[PDB]
Structure 1
Amino acid sequence: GDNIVLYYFDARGKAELIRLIFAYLGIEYTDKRFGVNGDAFVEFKNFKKEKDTPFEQVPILQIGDLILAQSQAIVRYLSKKYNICGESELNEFYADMIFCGVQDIHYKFNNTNLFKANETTFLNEDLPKWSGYFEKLLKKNHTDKYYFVGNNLTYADLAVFNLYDDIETKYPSSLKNFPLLKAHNEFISNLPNIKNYITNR
């Protein structure tokens, strides 16, 4: 068995979804975070010397000496390996698509802040539009716990979960008008393995 190491900053950012997947699947790894105690940047600067990275960016997932970079690609990789990307060519596609939708609004969020005075337009206009998109998708199956794709958990379920979870750390629990989404995020929040990672966090 190869040693599994995850390199990133001492934050969620683009790394939390990978951490959730390892938790969901319960696979063990070292969660190496830069700047727990010292200067995150110096560590990162030296890391990029010591480690051979494609794009001088983290997350970096290391199995053995195999070096894997790009969080989305890591998630897709982790998901085939561990059977959470759906059971058909169509359903693999849908999961990918809804994950693509996630990283879009998830980016909009990491682009909203006080200084930019776009916090209300995010809250008032961006989010609800996207919450509605996911809501209408959970309605598409409607075919009972809550899955985006097929009748089994996929990484799109975690990604959606993580999106709203991360938003809920900046801004108010805003999912009243989206009952299916609200149910979906809680259902998955209370899966034993994820629920124990969360409270450990």
Structure 2
Amino acid sequence: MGDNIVLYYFDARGKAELIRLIFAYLGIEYTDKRFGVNGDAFVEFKNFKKEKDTPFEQVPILQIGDLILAQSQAIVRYLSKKYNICGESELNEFYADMIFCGVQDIHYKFNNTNLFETTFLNEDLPKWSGYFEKLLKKNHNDKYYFVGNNLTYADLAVFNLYDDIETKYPSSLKNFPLLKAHNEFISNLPNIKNYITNRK
């Protein structure tokens, strides 16, 4: 809706996973195109760039019909605004954005470690986990929202962050109860639960 949405990315979670989580949450049907399923992802990406008119030669790429959408954050924000999971006020829209940008700071650090340890594990992670803990405390019953009294993409971003972190470091939410409960809450959402338990 549509009517044919194609997400282009490598065979990984990475920069596309939050877009996939947003699609799963909103029940948006789409083609999840992944480079590397058909053997060589490097050649398939090279061919993709010739085929599709990408503005920055990067993925994820969201294609809506002939419409080419690039940049994870821009796509996430575009989808969240279109389907009203960005905040129930002008200021709440900002807070979701602020939190999302904060996620990007600590997620980048995780990406730089996981994909490309000491500094992250001892200095960045616990400090930034404290930041989000305090932000939940500010706003927080089985519901855990970072913004207002409804789900924002910020919730899904923080969930994706620590879900991505907890694949490499499982015990990282032990000392952060609200963040742990937020993870549990988001992971068990009707639309979210099925996607995460059934994804590769």
Q: Which residue number in structure 2 is paired with residue 108 of structure 1?
A: 109
Provide closer, same or farther for how the CA distance between residues 114 and 143 of structure 1 changes in structure 2, counting only shifts above 3 A. closer
Secondary structure of residue in 2 paired with 1:5: strand
| TM-score normalised by structure 1 residue count | 0.95
| TM-score normalised by structure 2 residue count | 0.95
Structure 2 CA distance, aligned partners of 1:169 and 1:109?
11
List gaps (5 residues or longer) in structure 1.
Answer: none
Provide closer, same or farther for how the CA distance between residues 71 and 143 of structure 1 changes in structure 2, counting only shifts above 3 A. same
**Over residues 78-131 of structure 1, what are the superposed CA-to-partner deviations in whole Å (9 max), with x where a residue is unaligned?**
00110000011100000000000001100001111598xxx1221122100000
**Over residues 164-201 of structure 1, what are the superposed CA-to-partner deviations in whole Å (9 max), with x where a residue is unaligned?**
00111112321121101110111010011111001111
Cα RMSD of the aligned pairs, angstroms, is: 1.5
Structure 2 CA distance, aligned partners of 1:146 and 1:172?
21
Provide closer, same or farther for how the CA distance between residues 43 and 90 of structure 1 changes in structure 2, counting only shifts above 3 A. same
Secondary structure of residue in 2 paired with 1:68: strand
Structure 1 CA distance, aligned partners of 2:191 and 2:17?
15
Secondary structure of residue in 2 paired with 1:33: strand
Structure 1 outlier segments of 4+, above 6 Å: none
Give the conservation status (yes or no) of the 8 Å contact 2:114–2:168: no
Secondary structure of residue in 1 paired with 2:38: coil
Provide closer, same or farther for how the CA distance between residues 52 and 114 of structure 1 changes in structure 2, counting only shifts above 3 A. closer
Taking every aligned residue pair, what percent have the same amino acid on both sides? Answer: 99
Size of the aligned set, in residue pairs, is 198
Structure 2 CA distance, aligned partners of 1:143 and 1:29?
34
Q: Which residue number in structure 2 is paired with residue 198 of structure 1?
A: 196
